Design a binder for this molecule. Structure first.
Ligand SMILES: Cc1cc2nc3c(=O)[nH]c(=O)nc-3n(C[C@H](O)[C@H](O)[C@H](O)COP(=O)(O)OP(=O)(O)OC[C@H]3O[C@@H](n4cnc5c(N)ncnc54)[C@H](O)[C@@H]3O)c2cc1C
Length: 439
């Protein structure tokens, strides 16, 4: 039609920022991309660096952005993970050719992406956004700080926040922890298992990620005990395939002599307690005069998890949802944002957007769902993707991709120790590679 070109800031050059830059460019917009680090890739850049505070609670601490540990492999098959128009297939020669590869293979994929779509060369590196303010007129000023202690600022029609949400930790509440004498850490600082050699380690977490770290630690630890509050029956349970790993429901009490008692009665002397309890949203740079808040991991209000109703479309967020396949979701979110900014498609009125968020909050409340699951969309994530695709006029998520997700979700819960290397959906792989031909 008669489109409109906007000048847009992108905050972050992880996977979300990379695809957002591409989708804004494809729709005719100009952009400035700010990346605090020295390379693109965000979380997928493994670093052995860890924060000086093992609990990552000291407010003046240096921040390490990545939470990856060294042996991490994807928890999704690579066919499922790729951008919709950029299949995450094997390289022509070399690399990690496994269906569930290591993090290095994902980073290489994002770097190839950044080159293929001309995004990488435009990222302003070592530019940390420290302040984002709305100007009288509806424009935005992004102020940034550089490596040398320099910095600057720039005005924008719109700002897309792509800063990730897997860096600022949240924690478990452990009874008696104030008198427990051992080592306490957050998994944000977990990298390698060797320093746990012959230690007794408690891992607190209910996700399959906590099981991954437990199995990694169990390579050297004397004993690994998982406190998994979603478990209610049959503990203490040995982990199949491991002689030195046990599953529990929850810590009942920690003691001054180092012992930890689980609800199932198991008592053990513990050297290390690791919180694998996840993260919180954190946008210290963002000044909205209270229009956007973060409250027990509810961000917003955000229309469709993206647009603050009062500030839409000049402010938007890519990659808020969790329990998702992230790369195609961020792709479709930023495709939607770009088409809105260009005028090719419309948003509802501010009042209608605000009513939609309120309706969603009341559905949650009428279903007993606590605040902190507001952006958890694991059950209907591809319906959400398809809603975005229909807004943009893009194809819907492939059926093989829905089915692969259900299959790996089932295998991850049933066989956490083997789902990455033993699978039975070769027929879905066949389908996926068929659709990949056109690219
Ligand atoms: C342990 C772990 C395992 C995972 N495994 C999988 C998996 O197997 N498969 C999968 O598809 N997904 C997985 N994910 C999800 C992963 O987060 C997404 O794949 C995706 O990387 C989200 O990227 P992002 O761009 O939103 O955030 P990030 O990767 O965090 O990137 C955000 C970027 O913004 C930059 N930034 C932050 N603040 C500023 C600022 N103020 N100014 C300038 N720049 C800034 C950061 O430096 C960073 O580069 C995993 C996540 C974790 C934590």
């Amino acid at each position: 039609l008669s489109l409109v070109t906007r000048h847009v800031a992108i905050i972050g050059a992880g996977a979300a920022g990379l695809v957002t830059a591409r989708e804004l460019r494809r729709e005719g917009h100009t952009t400035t991309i700010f990346e605090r680090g020295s390379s693109i890739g965000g979380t997928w850049i493994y670093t052995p660096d860890t924060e000086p505070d093992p609990m990552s609670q000291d407010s003046s601490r240096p921040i390490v952005h990545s939470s990856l540990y060294k042996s991490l492999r994807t928890n999704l098959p690579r066919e499922v993970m790729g951008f919709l128009d950029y299949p995450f297939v094997e390289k022509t020669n070399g690399g990690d050719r496994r269906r569930f590869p290591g993090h290095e293979e994902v980073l290489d994929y994002l770097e190839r992406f950044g080159r293929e779509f001309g995004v990488s060369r435009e990222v302003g590196m070592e530019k940390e956004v420290v302040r984002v303010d709305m100007e009288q007129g509806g424009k935005w000023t992004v102020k940034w700080k550089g490596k040398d202690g320099g910095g600057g600022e720039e005005g924008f029609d719109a700002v897309v926040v792509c800063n990730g949400h897997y860096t600022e930790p949240r924690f478990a509440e452990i009874p008696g922890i104030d008198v427990w004498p051992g080592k306490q850490m957050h998994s944000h600082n977990y990298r390698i298992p060797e320093p746990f050699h012959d230690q007794v380690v408690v891992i607190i977490g209910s996700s399959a990620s906590a099981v991954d770290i437990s199995r990694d630690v169990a390579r050297f630890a004397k004993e690994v005990h998982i406190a998994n509050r979603s478990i209610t029956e049959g503990t203490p349970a040995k982990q199949p395939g491991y002689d030195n790993m046990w599953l529990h429901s929850m810590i009942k009490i920690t003691h001054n002599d180092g012992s930890v008692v689980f609800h199932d009665g198991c008592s053990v002397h513990v050297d290390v307690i690791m919180h694998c309890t996840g993260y919180v949203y954190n946008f210290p740079f963002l000044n909205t005069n209270g229009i956007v808040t973060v409250d027990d991991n509810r961000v917003g209000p955000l229309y469709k998890h993206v647009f603050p109703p009062l500030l839409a479309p000049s402010l938007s967020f890519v990659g808020i949802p969790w329990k998702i396949v992230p790369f195609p979701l961020c792709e479709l979110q930023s495709k939607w944002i770009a088409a809105v900014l260009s005028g090719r498609i419309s948003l509802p009125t501010k009042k209608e957007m605000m009513e939609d968020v309120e309706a969603y909050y009341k559905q949650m409340e009428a279903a007993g769902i606590p605040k902190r699951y507001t952006h958890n969309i694991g059950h209907n994530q591809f319906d959400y993707d398809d809603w975005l695709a229909n807004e943009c006029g893009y194809s819907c998520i492939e059926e093989w991709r829905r089915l692969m997700y259900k299959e790996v979700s089932k295998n991850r819960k049933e066989r956490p120790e083997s789902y990455r290397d033993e699978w039975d959906d070769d027929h879905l792989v066949a389908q996926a590679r068929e659709t990949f031909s056109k690219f």
